[PDB]
């Protein structure tokens, strides 16, 4: 059952916030999708672009919330549901403030540290699914983090998220076929400099 | 109806937002109520934060909606048309790209001017509301608006934008009690002291 079934981007929709720091798990399961042919398409029924296709010989559901980031739950709680996906089966991809740019972890359980798409999902599925923490670097301070969030990285920045993301594009075949230890030390090791 | 009997303020929801530019609406409805000592309430069956109270002599309502701007129609429309509210008594206060800080216009009419809560608006009521156009400056192109509206404005921008919106409160008198263009030409005529 170790099976990675469900991966979930978070972000919010628009073309205004598609380039902004906060939206990293949507690049991740935007990037993934087309890396494997797999259509997202509106999916108003569950507030949200989804698509289902073969991933590595696998049948995976891929989410991205349309509610805006602080109500992701409203969309990944009663899709889930439906679907009848275990916590255990999910993946969610998000930034990660407490990462630099080019860092990238796979992390199990815990808490949302502050991430309020996280903060909107953990009360109502738990805390035991999977998490791609896509480092965007911390601006410094409390009332800084907004803009960060809700800004576009530089180039060099970007440039160094980016290769991240594709290192962990690289190991998704190990994450849907089962081998969630083997995808957390290869995903994990990822060097950017 | 002749007076404005509904005062909406475009905005974001979330302390992450509270600071905006494109929150300037949500600031003038939220010290518009307070100055009045109307209370604005959780109102989640109109998907949004409202109040109603004596403004001037006459019942007003006031809204912010909580959809998150460019979905601003989901609360206005439905509010307004249940309690009956025309939009000729409709004023919906909101950031202006087209106008420098510091610089406030009260107009009648006319379509979004590409302000994407405007949008969610006008196809349901029609345009035939008021507006209250708080100037916020442009950036200088399309690219830049994004990081502009969901940005905070510098310090001595901040004070212009809120000494315009100081002398908008002062004139809501003259709109609640149905004289729109002596309103029209008071407000209109503001400049920073």
Request: aromatic share 6%; net charge positive.
């Amino acid at each position: 059952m170790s099976n990675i079934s469900l991966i979930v981007g978070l972000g919010n929709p628009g073309s205004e916030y598609a380039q902004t720091r906060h939206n990293a798990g949507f690049w991740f399961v935007e990037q993934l999708a087309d890396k494997y042919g797999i259509t997202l398409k509106n999916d108003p029924k569950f507030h949200g672009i989804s698509g289902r296709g073969n991933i590595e010989g696998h049948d995976v559901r891929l989410l991205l919330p349309m509610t805006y980031m602080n109500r992701s739950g409203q969309s990944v709680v009663p899709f889930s549901k439906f679907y009848q996906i275990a916590p255990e089966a999910i993946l969610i991809a998000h930034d990660e403030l407490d990462m630099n740019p080019g860092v990238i972890r796979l992390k199990t359980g815990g808490g949302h540290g502050g991430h309020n798409g996280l903060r909107d999902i953990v009360p109502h599925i738990g805390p035991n699914f999977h998490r791609l923490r896509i480092g965007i670097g911390h601006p410094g301070s409390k009332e800084r983090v907004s803009g960060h969030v809700l800004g576009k990285a530089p180039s060099n920045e970007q440039s160094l998220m980016d290769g991240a993301i594709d290192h962990a594009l690289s190991k998704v075949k190990l994450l849907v076929q089962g081998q969630v230890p083997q995808a957390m030390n290869q995903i994990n090791a990822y060097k950017p400099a």
